[PDB]
Amino acid sequence: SGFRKMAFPSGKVEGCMVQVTCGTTTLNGLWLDDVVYCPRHVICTSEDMLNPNYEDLLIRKSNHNFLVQAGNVQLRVIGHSMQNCVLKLKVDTANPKTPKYKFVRIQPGQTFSVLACYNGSPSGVYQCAMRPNFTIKGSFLNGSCGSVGFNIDYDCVSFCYMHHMELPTGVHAGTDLEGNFYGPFVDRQTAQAAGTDTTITVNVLAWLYAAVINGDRWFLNRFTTTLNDFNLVAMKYNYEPLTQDHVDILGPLSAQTGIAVLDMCASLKELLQNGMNGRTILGSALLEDEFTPFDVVRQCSGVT
Amino acid sequence: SGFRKMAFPSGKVEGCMVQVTCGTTTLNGLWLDDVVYCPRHVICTSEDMLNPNYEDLLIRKSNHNFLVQAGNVQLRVIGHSMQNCVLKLKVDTANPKTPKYKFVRIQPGQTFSVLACYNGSPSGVYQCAMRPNFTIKGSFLNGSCGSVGFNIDYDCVSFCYMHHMELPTGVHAGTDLEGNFYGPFVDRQTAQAAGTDTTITVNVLAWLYAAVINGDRWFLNRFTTTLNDFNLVAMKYNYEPLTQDHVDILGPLSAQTGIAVLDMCASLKELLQNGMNGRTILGSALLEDEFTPFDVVRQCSGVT
Ligand SMILES: O=C(Cc1cccc(Cl)c1)Nc1nnc2ccccn12
Ligand SMILES: O=C(Cc1cccc(Cl)c1)Nc1nnc2ccccn12
Numbered sequence: 001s002g003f004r005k006m007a008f009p010s011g012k013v014e015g016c017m018v019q020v021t022c023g024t025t026t027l028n029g030l031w032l033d034d035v036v037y038c039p040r041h042v043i044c045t046s047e048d049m050l051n052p053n054y055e056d057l058l059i060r061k062s063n064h065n066f067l068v069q070a071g072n073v074q075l076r077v078i079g080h081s082m083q084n085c086v087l088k089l090k091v092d093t094a095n096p097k098t099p100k101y102k103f104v105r106i107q108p109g110q111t112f113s114v115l116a117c118y119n120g121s122p123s124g125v126y127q128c129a130m131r132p133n134f135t136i137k138g139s140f141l142n143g144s145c146g147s148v149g150f151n152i153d154y155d156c157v158s159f160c161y162m163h164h165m166e167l168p169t170g171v172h173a174g175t176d177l178e179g180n181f182y183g184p185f186v187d188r189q190t191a192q193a194a195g196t197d198t199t200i201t202v203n204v205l206a207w208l209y210a211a212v213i214n215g216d217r218w219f220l221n222r223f224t225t226t227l228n229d230f231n232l233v234a235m236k237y238n239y240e241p242l243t244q245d246h247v248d249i250l251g252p253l254s255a256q257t258g259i260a261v262l263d264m265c266a267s268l269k270e271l272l273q274n275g276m277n278g279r280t281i282l283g284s285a286l287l288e289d290e291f292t293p294f295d296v297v298r299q300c301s302g303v304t
Numbered sequence: 305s306g307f308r309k310m311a312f313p314s315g316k317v318e319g320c321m322v323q324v325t326c327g328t329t330t331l332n333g334l335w336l337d338d339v340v341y342c343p344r345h346v347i348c349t350s351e352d353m354l355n356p357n358y359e360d361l362l363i364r365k366s367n368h369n370f371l372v373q374a375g376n377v378q379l380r381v382i383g384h385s386m387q388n389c390v391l392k393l394k395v396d397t398a399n400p401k402t403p404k405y406k407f408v409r410i411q412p413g414q415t416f417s418v419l420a421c422y423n424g425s426p427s428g429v430y431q432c433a434m435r436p437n438f439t440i441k442g443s444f445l446n447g448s449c450g451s452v453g454f455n456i457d458y459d460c461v462s463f464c465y466m467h468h469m470e471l472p473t474g475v476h477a478g479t480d481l482e483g484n485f486y487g488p489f490v491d492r493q494t495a496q497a498a499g500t501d502t503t504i505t506v507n508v509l510a511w512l513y514a515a516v517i518n519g520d521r522w523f524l525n526r527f528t529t530t531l532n533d534f535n536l537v538a539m540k541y542n543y544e545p546l547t548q549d550h551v552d553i554l555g556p557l558s559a560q561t562g563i564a565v566l567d568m569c570a571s572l573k574e575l576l577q578n579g580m581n582g583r584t585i586l587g588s589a590l591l592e593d594e595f596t597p598f599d600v601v602r603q604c605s606g607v608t
Contacts, residue, residue: 004443
C-alpha cells in the first residue's frame, strides 16, 4: 500500500551521462554505443542565442572543438553531425555501459523519468509528464541541458526527452532523441509562450483508481455519467476530452476495483464541481494528473 | 527553475540489491563488501509472524538454507548472524559494485530516497521522510521488504533505512542498517498503531523558501512573529515546535532570499490560519514537509 510519484531506477542512464564542452559552453551528453547526443546550442555563445544560424555556426567547429569527458576520462571525437536540434558526436569508443535502448517520441499525457545532470554528473531523478501544451514541469538549473527523459521496460531504456530550454514562465521545453522539439518551441532566446496547460483527464481517473486500491474512498459517490456529459464538465474545467480509447485503457483498473469507468467519471465530475472541501486523496489536496493508467498498474503490481 | 520531489540517482544502490530466500520466503538483501543484510523475518513462515522467537527459529537454519542470488548468479553463504532485527549473511565474494558507504541512523524530519525492489530487482525510486511518529509514507507491496533508504554525498552512500513492515493503516516501519527499528515498532504481526503524524515545520519553511526562489510569492505577507507566538499556532495545527536550531539551519535560505526566518514564520502562520483559498504553492494545494533545508539548497544549487 501507499502511492508515490515514483521514478524508474536511474543506473542504466547514469552509465550514459557525459560532459560536452564547446568553446566556453558546457552541458550534458548521452553516450550510447559510439555516439554522444547533445543539444546543438552547445556551439552557441551568449550573443549567438538571440538569432542563431546553427548551420553557419557549425561550419566554424571541428571534431577537436567538442570536448567529451566520461567521468574523468576524455573521449576522442572522430565525427560530428547535426540532426534537427541535436548534435551527434561520433567517438572512437563504444560506451561499455550502453544498455539495451530505443528512441521514442512520446505523446502528451505520457509520463517519464528525468535524470537531472550537471557537468555530466547525475544530481537527481524525478518523475514528470509531457504536458498537453508540450512543455514539461521539470526542475532544471543552468548547465542541466542535455539531461534526458526515459522509461524502462525490464532491461530496455526508451529515451524520450532531451532537455534544451527554460521558457520565461519557468516551464521546460526539449526534444526527442532525433532532435525534434516537442511542441512549437525553437532553440532561440525569443518570445515563446506556452499554450493552455490542460489537465490529463485519463491520468486523473487512473490516480482515482490508485486511491481506491490504496483505501482512499471518500470521493466515491452514488452517481454515474456518460462520455458526452462528463466531457461538457471537463471542457469547463480545462480538462482534456475523455475518449473511448481512454475508457478502454482504464479497463484493467475498472476490473480490479469493480468500479465502472463512467462511475469513476461521475466521482471526478463531483470533485470538479464541489472541490475537495479541505480533504485529501493519496496525500494530495489537488487532483494529480502525472500518473498514467500503466503507471498505476505497474506501481500497484510491482513490476521490476 | 521548477521544484520537484527529487530522489538521489539510484545506480550505486541498484548494484547492491540481491534476492534472499529462506524456506518459502523471498525478500531483498543489500550486498556490501562480503555481507548481505536483510530483515530477520525472512526466516519466518506465515504462522511464525504472530509471535516469533527469532533466536529459536534461527537455530533451525544453517548457511545453506539462505539462498542469495545477485542477478542470475548464486552467492555462497559462509556465515550468518543476527544483529537486532537484521540478518548479516557473510558470502564468499565481495560485491565488486560496492560503493563507498556508511550506515547512519536518521532523525525524524530527515528525508531520504527509497529504491523499491522485488526479488532483488529494482522497480522504482522515490523520495520520502522519516515522520515524527517514526513511520514512513512509502509505496511498498508484498516482497518489498529489505528495500533500502539512503542519501548520497558525491560518492558516499549513507544507508539509513531497511524496509520491514506495513502497519494496518498503510504506513511503513523499518530499521536502520544495524537492525534497530525506527520508533517503537517490532517485527511481529501484532497491534501496532502509529502516533500523531505531526507536520515537520522546518521542512515546510524550507519549501516556502524554495517557492520564493522559484517565483511563487503570493503568500508573502506584511507580518512578522516570534518563536513563542509562532509555536502557539504550530501546536494548534499539529506542527512540530520550531527551535532556534531550526532557525539557524534556515539561515542560508533566509540570506539567499532576504526574507527573515521569523517573517517566513508569519507567512506560514497566516497560511495555517487562513488556508490556501483555492491557490497553489509549487504545484501543491497543501503545505509540503518532505524537503529539508539541505534538500532545498541542494536542488536550488545543482549539487551532483
Ligand atoms: O534555457 C537555457 C539556455 C537556452 C536559451 C535559449 C534557447 C535555448 Cl535552446 C537554450 N538553459 C536552460 N535550460 N534549463 C534551464 C534552467 C535554468 C536556467 C537555464 N536553463
Ligand atoms: O508487513 C509485511 C510482512 C510482515 C508482517 C509482520 C511483521 C513484519 Cl516484520 C513483516 N510485509 C510488507 N512490508 N510492506 C508491505 C506492503 C504490502 C504487503 C506486505 N508488506
